[PDB]
Amino acid sequence: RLSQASVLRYYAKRFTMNVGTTAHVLGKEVAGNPWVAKAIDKLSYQETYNWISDYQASHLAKQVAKQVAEKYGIPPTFQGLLMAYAEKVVANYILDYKGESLTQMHDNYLYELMQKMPSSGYIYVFIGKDGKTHTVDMSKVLTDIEDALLKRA
Amino acid sequence: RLSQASVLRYYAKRFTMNVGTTAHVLGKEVAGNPWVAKAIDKLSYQETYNWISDYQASHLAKQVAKQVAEKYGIPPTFQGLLMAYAEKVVANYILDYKGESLTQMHDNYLYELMQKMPSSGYIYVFIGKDGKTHTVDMSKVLTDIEDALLKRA
Amino acid sequence: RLSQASVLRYYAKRFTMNVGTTAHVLGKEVAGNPWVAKAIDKLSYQETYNWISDYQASHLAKQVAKQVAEKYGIPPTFQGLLMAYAEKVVANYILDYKGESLTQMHDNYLYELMQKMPSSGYIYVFIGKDGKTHTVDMSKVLTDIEDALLKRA
Amino acid sequence: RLSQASVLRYYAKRFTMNVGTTAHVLGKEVAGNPWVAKAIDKLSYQETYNWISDYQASHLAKQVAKQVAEKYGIPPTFQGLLMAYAEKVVANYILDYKGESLTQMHDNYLYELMQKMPSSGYIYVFIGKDGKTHTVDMSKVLTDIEDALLKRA
Amino acid sequence: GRQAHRKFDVRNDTSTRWKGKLYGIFVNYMGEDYAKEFVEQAYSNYEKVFVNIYTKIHNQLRTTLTSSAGAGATFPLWQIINEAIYAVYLTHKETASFLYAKYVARGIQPNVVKKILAETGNALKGIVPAVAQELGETVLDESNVISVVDDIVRKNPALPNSYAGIILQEARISTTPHYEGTEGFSSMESAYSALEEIE
Amino acid sequence: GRQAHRKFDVRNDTSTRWKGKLYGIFVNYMGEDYAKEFVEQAYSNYEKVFVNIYTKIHNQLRTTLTSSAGAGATFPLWQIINEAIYAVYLTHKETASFLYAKYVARGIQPNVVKKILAETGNALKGIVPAVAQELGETVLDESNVISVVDDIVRKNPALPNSYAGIILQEARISTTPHYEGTEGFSSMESAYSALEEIE
Amino acid sequence: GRQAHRKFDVRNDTSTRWKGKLYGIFVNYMGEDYAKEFVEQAYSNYEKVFVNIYTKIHNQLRTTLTSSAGAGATFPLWQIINEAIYAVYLTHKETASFLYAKYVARGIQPNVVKKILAETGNALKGIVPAVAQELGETVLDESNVISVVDDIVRKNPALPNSYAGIILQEARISTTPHYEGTEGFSSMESAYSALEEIE
DNA sequence: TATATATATATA
């Protein structure tokens, strides 16, 4: 997860590649002067601003995915593959609308989640903490995630 | 086939006959001095330049012949005799036009490809890889090769 | 087997015959100059490139032959004669298709592996490491090697 | 024994015979140029790599032979003839299995260690450092060396 | 959307990337000479352990995995071939029955797990010499894998984590593919490496 | 276009061209004395094998070939008279029926192949003594060649490649055309050679 | 495919090839004079040992081998005539029964092995004088070879490897085919050598 | 080095 430290950690590591591109084969000579340090500092601050300022959509879709995933008792392993739709949909569909309809994309990624028996590959079986076995279908949980994201938006 | 090494291989073997003609009955005496080595080196480089720079027409005609030959399932043996027209035509006809018309040359080399029964000596029978027997006529495949070469040119 | 050193070993020994053909009866005189050493060096590098780059088919057929040979407990002596088909087939049949069918070639080399009693000369008897005697037929192991090579290709 | 210096000592002496085979009757002329020195250097390094990398089996069999030989108070002279089985067995039997069984080879080399009275030529008598005379049989010590090598492998 | 498609694999230059980045970090730490010397020995162990075992196993199992449960989400299953190497073999820490009972709960049906756990041993026995004699002369199959492989773990209790580590290959004998008579029959990459090296 | 018209044949000086070029190449290889001595023995085998068999067969078959399928493209057929010498005779590696079945696929109609394969044996029997007794006292013809010539190959299996090689002529007895009573009746070139040699 | 058909045999020029190549290698090693002198003595031993024994035996056994198990794969068997010379005769290291038991496992049926091991001794006794008296006045046959030939090896234990080597022929007496009264009756090659030498 | 059809760059 990201918290506090993550922004600083992304900030720190831009310095090397930025001072590389400012002065290409002159590192030792150029980097000595304080001015270039000031400028390259000042530049490497705006890139993190663009990154963090323009990442909220993905984080909020990721946020919405979690509580819906938890309510079915989904184990940790599949939570990431469920996390897929969050930004597979809050990027291609709602912000810019690449030329596709929703249902065909729903079918497409379901063509990536299959079983391959030759079991219910669309309704997995899971074991809970109390030992109560219960099952969930991917189709309905996916329908819930897109319409929930649309209402949230 | 020629690739990379062929140019070097042609370059290497000019040295002996060139140092022979530079100094005729004085090989041991003359070749010792470095200067003559420099000059004969420098000369033997331009001959390969003339050869490779002025050979493209033949290679491209040879190129065009192959795919047309392959599409009829022609076996390897006759491919060379088909390769004949490639430069029999891209030399005498189109570059310089020696005083002949096309049809008579077409007849002439066909007077070199005959059968001699006393079979269809203009339509051979061939066995493919799958065992499917099929036949091709020389007249039409030749017509295809000249008009294809003309359009390519 | 070949590994690392083999390429260098083939490279080294081209130098003598190449400097021989570059300057025919002038070795001591010509080879002194550094330039000719540079050129003959540069030439002898491409020949190994052509050799190693264009040898993979044989090595992979040789690769496929081994595991099939081992699974029948074939002793070392006959492994080479089994190695025969590997490139007897990945050269004449699949790359260029000289004008033969498969079955007749299968019969031909079997006409080189016979017994000559006047025993099962197509089913030899072998003694394993544990003392368990078991037998293998050449016909089926050959059928396995060609269809395995074809699927591998 | 080999230690540190042995690898270098084997490396050094390949140079003469390698520069001989690279340029056959042209030593003084060719060896002057630095390039050939670079190449022949680079080649003579891989041969030692193959030698030392592929010699471990013999050294470990030699290792196992020693402690077993010492426990019977065998004097130095016969230790080499005992060293025989180490690689007489870790080469013909276990790595590649030439077509023999173990017992007959055991009999064969014992047909090389005999006495010839017309004494116990299979049970020699030895004098220790303290003056205590004791005897050992070759048959059992050989049985111990092969089964110990097999378990070690 | 659709910025790119990253791919992760061993790509003939991972060695130099790793060495360079960790040299850049440690050059301040110890000084130039020690830093330059250190990363070689640092990477040699990784090369000897990860590359020679896990890469080969994964490359062997890729085809059958895509055939068996091929999809976008082979992720939950990809860790099984990795787990079977460490916990069951080379440490004997966990019984095969325990792993089968555990990992079903995540939802993968038994047949694939049985096939994978058995198929791993067949390839692994050839690679690591120490496993072979302990396993003995047998052929693993899903019919009897759950019965047979756990027999050893029952007989021998939990081994220490040293055996998974550096003590693995040094004390055991074998032959490189160079020899002339073993199975082996060396791969071709040792030729392209030389061809590159010549210039 | 039309630079020249090269012709390829045995032209009474091939010996010296071959010897000189291969002496020029090997003079650096071994030293002058060994190089000068070596090429003589090197060329003697080629002279004994190629010249005494293949040249005579080709010179015999040229006329009937030009008569039968004379054209510019006798190339696909020229290799048959060369193939029949090695595979069928002198090694018994391939049955005549197999060759007939194989080589038709390239498109040459059967009658010419039958005529050539039979005509080759008639000339070959006179040249090589070892073939004669194995073939026996018979006359080959396209009517019965495919029936008769393959009989021997059926009876005797694939011979080793040594017999095609150097072991060919040394152990068998015959008479040079010099004698007085054999067929022979030596050619005239042995006179022009002397006339040249006298100066 | 079908690049060529290499043949390997002793071809009246192997001497000069060997001498020249090994002179080219050693000229840098020691200097010109020593290198020129050395290869003569180097090759004389090889000529005296390999040529005078193994070549004759192989040339004798070729015909019966092609008759007995003639095929492309006479390779597994070709080493028997070579092995019988060294291990059984001239060193007494291995009993004939042991060799028969060993080499059957490779799959060749007993009758051919019995015929070959017996036929080798008949030819070998004539060539090497030292073998004759030890073998005595007997005729070897597959009926009794396995009974008789191993008798000597039972009586006399494993001889050292010196006897296979240089000590072989020098101390024993015989007559060259030149004499007038022995079996001998010299071959004709000593005439072609002179005829070549005259020019 | 031969056995056939056309090539382009060099020695006379």
Next chain:
DNA sequence: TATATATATATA
């Protein structure tokens, strides 16, 4: 054109 020096396009 004929003499022979080297390179490409398929099997002897």
Next chain:
DNA sequence: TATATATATATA
């Protein structure tokens, strides 16, 4: 360097 079956790249 031999004794057998097929290889690919080079000298004629």
Next chain:
DNA sequence: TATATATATATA
């Protein structure tokens, strides 16, 4: 095809 220059796949 035959002549001989070097490399791979098992034992003389």
Next chain:
DNA sequence: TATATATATATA
């Protein structure tokens, strides 16, 4: 460099 038993990597 010899006097014996086995080695592995290289020149032919």
Next chain:
DNA sequence: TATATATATATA
């Protein structure tokens, strides 16, 4: 296999 180029395991 035999020819000779270098390395290991005990005393001449």
Next chain:
DNA sequence: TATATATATATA
């Protein structure tokens, strides 16, 4: 550093 599905900001 790998083994899979999607991310946004940067070097070419």
Next chain:
DNA sequence: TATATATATATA
């Protein structure tokens, strides 16, 4: 798109 520089979401 493919090449590799850094950050997030679960186990090797």
Next chain:
DNA sequence: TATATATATATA
């Protein structure tokens, strides 16, 4: 810095 069982936060 080693000899064993689990940790959480960082470099690749």
Next chain:
DNA sequence: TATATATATATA
């Protein structure tokens, strides 16, 4: 997972 950077819980 394996590579090595630092902190906690008992004796070498």
